[PDB]
Structures are given as C-alpha cells and as structure tokens.
Amino acid sequence: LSCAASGTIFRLYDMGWYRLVASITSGGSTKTISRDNNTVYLAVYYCNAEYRTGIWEELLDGWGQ
Amino acid sequence: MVTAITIMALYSIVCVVGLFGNFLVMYVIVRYTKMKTATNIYIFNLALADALATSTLPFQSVNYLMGTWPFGNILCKIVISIDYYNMFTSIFTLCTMSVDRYIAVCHPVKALDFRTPRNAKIVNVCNWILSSAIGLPVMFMATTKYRQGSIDCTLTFSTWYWENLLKICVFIFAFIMPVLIITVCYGLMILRLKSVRLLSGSREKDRNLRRITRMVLVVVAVFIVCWTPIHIYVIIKALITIPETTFQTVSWHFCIALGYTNSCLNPVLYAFLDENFKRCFREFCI
Ligand SMILES: C[C@H]1CN(C[C@H](Cc2ccccc2)C(=O)NCC(=O)O)CC[C@@]1(C)c1cccc(O)c1
C-alpha cells in the first residue's frame, strides 16, 4: 500500500498514512514507512502529503481517495 | 523646442502622480496602528525621499523650456543637493531593508530582539546623517553662473582631480558596494528558503514572511533597472569624448528621465503586492 504523488510540486515535505498510523519526513525520520524522493510505501486508510507549489507560496496538504 | 515641450509634459505627469502616491503611502502608515512594522518604517523613508525628488521637476522643466534658470541661487543649491540626496538615501534604505529581511529569515531567535521599530527609526536617522557627508559639499559648491547667453545652474569645482573624484565616489559608494551587500543577503536567504519546511512554526507566519520578502525583492530590482543606464553613461562619457550629435542629446535626456520616473512607480507596487496597503488605499478613497 503506497501513496504516490504526482503533479506540479516545487517541494514535497512530510508524507503519512491516516486512518496517524505512520509519518515519514523527507530526511527519513519516521513516527515502517519508506519514502523515495516521489512515493512512500508503508478500516480504510488515506494517503496524506504536505507540499509547496513555489518558493514564495504557502504550505499545503493533499489527501487521497 | 520639441524636446523641451516633451520633457515638460512627461515631467508634469510624473510630478502629479508621484506626489499624490507618496503622500498617500505616508498618510496610511501614520493613520493606521496595524501598519507600523520595521519594514513599514523603511518603506516610509523611501517614499519621503521620492516626494522630495518629485517636487523639484517643474523648475527643471521650466528651465529646459525657457533656456534660462530664473529661480535664483538658493533654489539652485537646494535642487542640486536634493538630486544627490535622492540617490544616496534611496540606495542605503534599500540596503538596510535587505539586511532586516535577512535577520528575520535566518536568525529568528535573535531577530526578535533587533527588529523592534525604534531600531528602524534610529537606522533611518543614521542613514540621513551618513548621506549628508556627500550631500552638503555638493550644496556648498553649486552656483548660478551668468553665461552671456543665459543663466546656468551648475557645480563649481576647484578640475580633473576634483570632478572625476566626485563621479568615481558616486559610482563606488552609492552603487557597487550596496549592490554586492544586497546580492549576498539574497543569496543566503534563498539558500535558507529552499530547504526549510517551516520558517516560523506557524503556517500563517511562514506565508507572511515569504510574501514580504518577495515584495522587497521586486522593489530592489525595479530600482536597479531604472538607475543603471545613467550610471554607465556618466562613466562612458567621462573617458571617450563622444561627438556631439542629436542621438547624444536625446539619449542623455531619456536616461535621466527614466531615473526620475522610478520615483512614482513604487506606490503602485505597494498596492498590488500588499493586502494591507491595498485595503487602506481603498478605504481612503471610499
Ligand atoms: C542625477 C543625474 C541627473 N542630474 C540632472 C540635474 C537636474 C537639473 C538640476 C537643475 C537644473 C536643471 C536640471 C542637473 O542637470 N545637474 C547639473 C549639475 O549640477 O551639474 C545630473 C547628474 C546625473 C546625470 C548623475 C547620474 C548618475 C551619477 C552622477 O554622478 C550624476
């Protein structure tokens, strides 16, 4: 069960699985999730990812189906 | 003839727009309590210098139209000193703005202590005191020379040593060195911004910080683009003895006109690029 990301993203920050099961930071700090700098691999569960579209833009979050 | 009328027309359009816009910015900063910030103290100093820069342009337009300076000696000494003050105060105010945004972005724990507004006010007073060292000698020198054809208003030097020296000092201290300081501060800030997830902990604080930083960068870039060509022209004229021709006179006046035009541009950028300024302007108008 992976939570891949696509689209126009300047930088992808913290990725995670939410039922808060797991969090993987960009460095690799974890709170069993492995992330490759563009997908992470770890009741319905949902992909969550934080991102910034541009250098001057604001931090956003994108959920999944 | 035709050139003098064109200059008068453009100068009057740059004079009314600039004076109105820079009066409005200062009024809004004074009137509303929320507006006061360290950056706003720096933006207020820039717009003071541009109001003083635009109030001179009618006398110059009349001088070009009539071929003679009829306004007297003292007004000649004030106008020329203001011409130099514009350049030095504006470049130093932009430099201090950039260092303030550097302290805010890269050293927040110690940024908090040094970004109080009173510090910005003292910084601005120090900026004017420093710029006087160049400004006051120019005021003391300027004179009305009674040429047989017509009165002229110019700078009297004691000539090669004393005149090339003034042009070199203006090229070095008031252009190159502040540009290097600004470029290094923005290179370091761009380094910090590209690799941080959050800059101030709170998401809103992060967005506000990045917005103000971008606005300051746009102002700096616009000023450099407006002022570089006259600066290069002064140097290339000093060393080459260009022949006199129509191209020379027209190009010379056009570069001076661009440098003056920049004085009215900033109030429009403040309104497009800042929510608080845009809101206050709308509330003021209506
Ligand atoms: C600032 C730039 C424009 N002024 C124009 C000024 C306006 C004026 C004043 C009174 C009557 C009519 C016109 C002027 O004509 N001043 C005559 C004088 O004092 O010699 C000139 C110097 C200038 C090109 C300059 C640019 C860059 C670097 C630099 O060193 C110098």
Q: What single string gives the DSSP state of each residue in B96-162?
A: HHHHHHHHHHH-HHHHHHHT-HHHHHHHHHHHHHHHHHHHHHHHHH-EEEE-SSSEEEE-----HHH
CA distance A26 to A37: 8
Closest CB from A11, A26, A56 relative to B211: A56
B162-168 long-range contacts, CB within 8 A, separation 24+: B164/B238, B166/B138, B167/B234, B167/B235, B167/B238
Is there a contact between A59 and B197 if contact means CB atoms under 8 Å apart? Answer: yes
DSSP H or E stretch at residue B241: none
Q: Which residues contact B208 (CB under 8 A, 6 or more apart)?
A: none
Q: A38 lies in which domain range?
A: 2-63
Tell me if B65 CB under 6 Å of ligand 1: no
Q: Which method was used?
A: cryo-EM
Secondary structure (3-state) at A48: strand
- Ligand 1 atom showing the smallest separation from residue B138 Cα: 19
Q: Which residue of B has its CA nearest to A25?
A: B197
Is there a contact between A56 and B197 if contact means CB atoms under 8 Å apart? Answer: no
Question: Amino acid identity of B64?
Answer: Y
Helices (H) and strands (E) in chain A, counts: 0, 7
Tell me if B81 CB under 6 Å of ligand 1: no
Q: Which residues of A touch B190 (CB under 8 A)?
A: 55
- Give the bridge partners for A34, in sequence order: A41
Distance B163 CA to ligand 1 centre (A): 13
Cβ proximity of B177 and B94 under 8 Å = no
Q: E strands along chain A, which residues?
A: 2-4, 11-18, 22-25, 34-36, 39-41, 46-52, 60-63
Secondary structure (3-state) at B263: helix
CA distance B286 to B40: 23
- Other CB atoms within a 10 A radius of the CB of residue B258 amount to 15
Tell the residue nearest (CA) to atom 28 of ligand 1: B231
Tell the residue nearest (CA) to atom 18 of ligand 1: B154
Number of domains, chain A = 1
Secondary structure (3-state) at A2: strand
- Following CA atoms B12, B16, B19, B23 in sequence, which dihedral angle do they give, to the nearest 10 degrees? 180
Cβ proximity of B27 and B277 under 8 Å = no
- Ligand 1 atom showing the smallest separation from residue B86 Cα: 1
Cβ proximity of A13 and B197 under 8 Å = yes
DSSP A62: E
DSSP H or E stretch at residue B36: none
Secondary structure (3-state) at B202: coil
Is A42 within 8 Å of chain B by CB?
no
Residue B129 in tokens = 């005191």
- Following CA atoms A47, A48, A50, A51 in sequence, which dihedral angle do they give, to the nearest 10 degrees? 40
CA distance B161 to B65: 33
Residue B2 in tokens = 């035709």
Distance B121 CA to ligand 1 centre (A): 30
Residue from B78, B83, B249, B258 to probe ligand 1 pocket by mutation (most atoms less than 8 Å from CB): B83
Backbone angles phi, psi at B147, to 5 degrees: -65, 145
DSSP H or E stretch at residue B244: none
